[PDB]
Task: structure prediction
Amino acid sequence: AETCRIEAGDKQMTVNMGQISSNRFHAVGEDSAPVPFVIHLRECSTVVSERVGVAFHGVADGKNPDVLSVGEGPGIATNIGVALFDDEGNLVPINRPPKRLYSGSTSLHFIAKYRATGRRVTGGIANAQAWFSLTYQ
Amino acid sequence: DLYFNPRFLAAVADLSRFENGQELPPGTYRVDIYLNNGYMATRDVTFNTGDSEQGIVPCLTRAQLASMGLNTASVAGMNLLADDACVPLTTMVQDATAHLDVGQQRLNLTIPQAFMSNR
Amino acid sequence: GVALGATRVIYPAGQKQEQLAVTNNDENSTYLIQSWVENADGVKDGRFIVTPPLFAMKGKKENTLRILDATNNQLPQDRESLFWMNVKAIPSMDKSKLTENTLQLAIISRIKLYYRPAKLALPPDQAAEKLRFRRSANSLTLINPTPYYLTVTELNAGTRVLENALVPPMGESTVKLPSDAGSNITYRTINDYGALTPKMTGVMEHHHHHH
Result:
């Protein structure tokens, strides 16, 4: 049996996070507006897609290793990271040692938000990268 | 006109090759070697950066080509090369071709019969 | 997007290589494909060589990966060894998106790589039957006397659906057993071709000479 063919809402697996407004953030931990995305598992039987193990990875933020770093360099925003949330509204763990099983649906729903890692956010460029693994039974 | 985010990698010096449409970076690859559609061998072949459309070219020695049936005396200048020299196949052997099918990991060579072992 | 040609790979001891297909179905996309093997614990293990380990594929295309056995005959030759094949698909990005704040994802597809010694007497499709069960007050233990990893699914105690279990050859695995779990155990397995074997009745572990 072939594995599922994997796609996001966007052809290139990208999510537009929108621009950073420093005024949105007045405390560490406060979030921006939700930006949903979805992981689709296509062209595969239910036997293959059931109880697939999903795990997220990426370069973790220094102040809050539970969120994605936006890096550092000129023009790049500071005191924000990108938090990922599951379909229960809960923060998705990243970069955990070598679990979480998904079943009942071939679309996996998530939300990304900017999360303040400092009381004083500065605007600018805020890109992030993550990867997820799909581990087949 | 391609862009790949380098933060997904790291030797990301190979990224510009992919952004310019190349399939495979220089390296040593396990390939099936064919010559004039005859199966020759399956072994590791080193592919160095070169003047090919593919951006890489296989390193084939005089002895390795002779082992495939090449009549090396028939090829002008071939005798001048050093033993370990990568034969510039497509310029030294008239009308010869080399192409790596990356998806199959198959090196397809062609050499005119004039230069092969015959009669 | 990218898919793999199979949900597990069986590597026959003695074979110089095994192969695995990688496909892309989208004419308007290029992926970088980065591939490697991990041991059972999910740690990189170069004793299986995956080649080519990094390449780009454009459009509707199939590419074949070679998996080479470089274990120097150091694995057991009476039972399977578990490894994991990893294939990461890294998408390009439209240059217009460089002017946008973007989260981009890549995806690692992970499948079992079973190194299978030669000359095992038990046919692979006769293994599932050999499984045995031991029951405690709050857990169920699966007992695998065969030389194959058994991937046990649709595991039921009464009407209670339990966790899947990967039961190592000549070994055991334990899952949780809810207090309301019924008595008769039933189960299936995923076979070499990634399909379900028939629903079977769980047989309990027994004492010497005993029903």
Chain C has two domains: 2-118, 122-211.
